[PDB]
Amino acid sequence: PDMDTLRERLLAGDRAALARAITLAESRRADHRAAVRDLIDAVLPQTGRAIRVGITGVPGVGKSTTIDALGSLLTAAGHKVAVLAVDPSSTRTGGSILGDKTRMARLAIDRNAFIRPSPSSGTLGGVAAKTRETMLLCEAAGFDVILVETVGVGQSETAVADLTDFFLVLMLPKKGIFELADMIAVNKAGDGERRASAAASEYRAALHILTPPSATWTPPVVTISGLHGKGLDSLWSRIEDHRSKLTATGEIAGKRREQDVKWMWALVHERLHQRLVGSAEVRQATAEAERAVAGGEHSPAAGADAIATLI
Amino acid sequence: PDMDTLRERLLAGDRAALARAITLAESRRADHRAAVRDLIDAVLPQTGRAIRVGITGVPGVGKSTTIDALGSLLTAAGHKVAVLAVDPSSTRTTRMARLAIDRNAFIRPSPSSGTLGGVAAKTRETMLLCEAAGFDVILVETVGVGQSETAVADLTDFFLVLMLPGAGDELQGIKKGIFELADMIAVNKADDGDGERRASAAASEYRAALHILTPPSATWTPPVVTISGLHGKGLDSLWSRIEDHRSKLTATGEIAGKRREQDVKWMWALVHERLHQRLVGSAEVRQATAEAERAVAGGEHSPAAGADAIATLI
Ligand SMILES: Nc1nc2c(ncn2[C@@H]2O[C@H](COP(=O)(O)OP(=O)(O)O)[C@@H](O)[C@H]2O)c(=O)[nH]1
Numbered sequence: 129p130d131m132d133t134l135r136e137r138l139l140a141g142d143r144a145a146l147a148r149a150i151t152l153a154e155s156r157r158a159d160h161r162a163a164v165r166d167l168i169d170a171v172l173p174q175t176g177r178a179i180r181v182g183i184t185g186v187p188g189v190g191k192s193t194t195i196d197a198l199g200s201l202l203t204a205a206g207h208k209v210a211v212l213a214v215d216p217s218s219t220r221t222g223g224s225i226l227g228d229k230t231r232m233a234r235l236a237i238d239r240n241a242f243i244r245p246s247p248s249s250g251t252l253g254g255v256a257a258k259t260r261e262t263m264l265l266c267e268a269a270g271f272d273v274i275l276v277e278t279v280g281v282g283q284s285e286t287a288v289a290d291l292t293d294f295f296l297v298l299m300l301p302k303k304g305i306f307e308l309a310d311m312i313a314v315n316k317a318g319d320g321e322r323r324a325s326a327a328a329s330e331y332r333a334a335l336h337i338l339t340p341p342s343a344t345w346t347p348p349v350v351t352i353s354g355l356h357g358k359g360l361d362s363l364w365s366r367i368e369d370h371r372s373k374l375t376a377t378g379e380i381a382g383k384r385r386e387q388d389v390k391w392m393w394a395l396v397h398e399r400l401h402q403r404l405v406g407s408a409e410v411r412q413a414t415a416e417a418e419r420a421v422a423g424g425e426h427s428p429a430a431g432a433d434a435i436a437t438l439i
Numbered sequence: 440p441d442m443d444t445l446r447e448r449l450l451a452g453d454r455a456a457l458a459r460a461i462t463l464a465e466s467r468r469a470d471h472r473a474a475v476r477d478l479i480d481a482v483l484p485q486t487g488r489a490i491r492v493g494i495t496g497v498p499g500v501g502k503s504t505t506i507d508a509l510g511s512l513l514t515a516a517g518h519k520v521a522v523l524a525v526d527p528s529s530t531r532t533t534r535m536a537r538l539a540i541d542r543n544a545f546i547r548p549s550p551s552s553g554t555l556g557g558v559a560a561k562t563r564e565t566m567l568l569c570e571a572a573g574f575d576v577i578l579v580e581t582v583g584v585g586q587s588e589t590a591v592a593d594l595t596d597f598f599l600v601l602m603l604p605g606a607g608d609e610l611q612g613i614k615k616g617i618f619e620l621a622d623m624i625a626v627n628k629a630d631d632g633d634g635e636r637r638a639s640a641a642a643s644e645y646r647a648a649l650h651i652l653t654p655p656s657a658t659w660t661p662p663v664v665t666i667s668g669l670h671g672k673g674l675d676s677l678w679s680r681i682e683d684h685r686s687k688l689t690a691t692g693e694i695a696g697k698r699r700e701q702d703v704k705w706m707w708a709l710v711h712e713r714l715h716q717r718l719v720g721s722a723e724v725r726q727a728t729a730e731a732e733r734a735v736a737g738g739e740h741s742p743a744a745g746a747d748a749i750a751t752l753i
Pocket residue numbers: 496497498499500501502503504505627628629630634666667668669670
């Protein structure tokens with residue numbers, strides 16, 4: 129596939145060129161990844177002009193429909209919205225070709241939206257680092273809103289926070305999640321407005337004893353109904369407010385640089401993993417070592433030196 | 440130095456054997472470190488019969504004073520208490536006055552290594568030595584300015600946060616990342632007078648907020664208590680809670696369960712430490728590694744481009 133032509137169509141907003149480049153970046157084949165490595169670098173100065181928001185929520189109510197509604201609001205307002213899934217179980221599959229795009233009915237047909245399932249990789253750090261490469265591609269292609277969502281039942285919340293500028297947690301009327309939140313939004317806001325309002329008050333009180341990482345921002349709690357689009361404009365205004373404030377201080381850029389280095393190393397460690405499971409003997413010996421350490425038969429360091437010797 | 444004897448003696452609770460064994464494992468070379476790995480491996484079945492407690496708090500909160508008092512209470516009750524430090528600053532290289540002369544105790548500063556993972560992994564190896572030598576209490580402390588808390592938590596069974604007595608507008612607050620780790624919060628400087636009053640006030644604010652983030656189930660809900668490390672206050676009550684936790688999480692099998700996940704994590708951290716030693720083995724490679732990482736950080740090259748450059752240096 130001609131890479132310069134691919135780059136120009138991607139830079140001109142061609143959705144199929146973008147998908148093609150992402151597919152190359154998602155690929156589990158080394159020659160594919162390598163090809164689109166130059167393209168991403170080349171296009172790097174056109175990346176970053178976007179709000180990156182990570183979104184997670186309690187098993188139950190309303191994340192997909194809330195994202196569909198938030199998504200639909202931002203497109204109708206002139207934005208281009210990518211929605212990327214991170215799911216740790218894609219370390220145990222080979223990915224998804226089609227994904228699951230109609231869990232968000234309006235965005236699934238919204239020509240100004242782009243939806244992509246969790247990429248496959250050997251490690252969760254690898255899944256996430258590929259997501260970062262995908263985010264960069266979407267941004268080069270002119271997407272100014274990147275929503276990254278946790279999709280497993282597994283533990284992807286920290287990785288998604290470390291992929292984004294702002295972490296939104298959606299709750300009903302897991303301690304780790306609370307202190308990742310730059311905002312909490314209580315879902316299903318009149319008979320239940322009462323309940324949401326109260327719960328919001330409770331969560332606001334809980335948050336108080338957690339010192340925010342920066343003096344520039346103090347996480348608020350808000351109420352919404354994703355079902356009926358209520359509260360979303362205000363919710364979004366805060367995220368925008370946060371963008372202006374932490375951009376002025378340089379803190380968004382500072383967070384992004386930290387994340388980028390974390391992802392680089394996750395990819396180095398992914399490549400190490402891939403070597404260790406890349407043939408039968410090494411793979412068997414690696415599992416043997418790990419198993420001995422877990423079972424308390426050999427010490428962490430004995431396990432480690434056995435693994436080091438296979439490399 | 441012969442290793443057959445050393446092992447026999449370490450197993451007998453010979454503190455000179457222990458001290459020697461440790462020196463070998465903190466030594467920054469092979470041959471030494473190899474032999475003291477096989478020993479650790481040999482004594483593994485004598486490890487683990489101990490309560491492991493991670494302790495953190497901001498510098499000046501009174502941690503070293505509190506550990507001094509707590510350790511001395513535990514040694515007077517017939518425990519053998521090792522006190523180990525994890526310091527991020529030892530990647531670039533007697534304050535407990537009573538414990539320092541107490542032969543029922545054993546204090547070691549942070550070990551040196553390339554990465555934090557490696558510092559923490561070394562400390563696990565040191566904990567196993569202490570345990571095989573008869574130590575039934577291991578206290579691991581964060582030391583210095585740094586992000587050492589997750590590591591200390593992942594070395595121990597119970598994570599204890601010491602906090603300042605400030606209440607209201609002077610309420611300290613729990614640092615990002617510590618709340619998910621904390622198994623108990625102890626507000627220190629609860630002295631006779633204003634201390635006990637303000638500290639209790641602080642504790643009640645933490646306690647009422649924690650009650651929101653909480654069910655009645657779960658094997659363990661974190662208590663909030665007050666202590667005075669300096670004046671000996673509330674330390675017995677604190678300890679009984681760590682003992683209740685030990686009992687509760689043993690019956691459910693969750694202590695053993697957590698230890699298994701920790702040990703694997705430390706194995707991978709040593710793997711990664713050995714990788715880091717290779718990337719810093721020569722000036723040529725150290726310089727190129729640093730350039731690749733700066734390229735990524737500067738937004739000049741993408742994370743994966745940075746990673747490909749480092750892969751090649753391997
Ligand atoms: N009033 C009071 N002061 C204390 C207490 N514990 C420690 N201090 C004092 O606080 C200062 C710092 O103590 P230190 O143990 O070095 O704290 P670290 O930096 O957290 O290890 C010293 O001057 C201590 O005497 C306490 O319970 N009450």
